[PDB]
Structures are given as C-alpha cells and as structure tokens.
Amino acid sequence: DDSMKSMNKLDVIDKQFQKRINGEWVSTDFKDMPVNENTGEFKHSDMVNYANKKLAEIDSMD
C-alpha cells in the first residue's frame, strides 16, 4: 500500500515541481500538496523521497 501511495504522491509532487520550474508559484509544502484519494495523506518524508529519487533519476538518464 505504501509503495502504491508513494508512487502516486511522488507523481503529484513532480507535477508541482514542474509547475514551479516553469515559473508559476507553487507552495511546495507537503501540507498543501493536493490529495488525490489515491495518494493519501502527505507526510514530510515524501519531499525527501522525491528529491532523492529525482536526483538518482537525473543521474540515471543517458
């Protein structure tokens, strides 16, 4: 269940960060991330998860 929820919530966190990079202001705080009923509640740990997984992914890209 956690793996499924984490997949969804890193997905939505990626959406928020992609919005931020384009320039528009996004809060990027775990409390105000939109819950999708597939995501569940946002802890503080998934911000760290998203950052680490994104950095590893950027390294993995060819």
């Binding site: 997905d11 990626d14 992609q18 990079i21």
Partner: peptide, 17 residues
C-alpha cells in the same frame, strides 16, 4: 571544418507524465 555546430538551446525539464 565543414560542419557548423548548432547554437545552444535553453535547457528545460520535461516528463512524459
């Protein structure tokens, strides 16, 4: 030489989904 290198494009972040 013969080839002319293409001048840089600003890098942006994209994801399929």
């Amino acid at each position: 030489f013969g080839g002319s290198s293409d001048e840089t494009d600003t890098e942006g972040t994209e994801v399929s989904g």
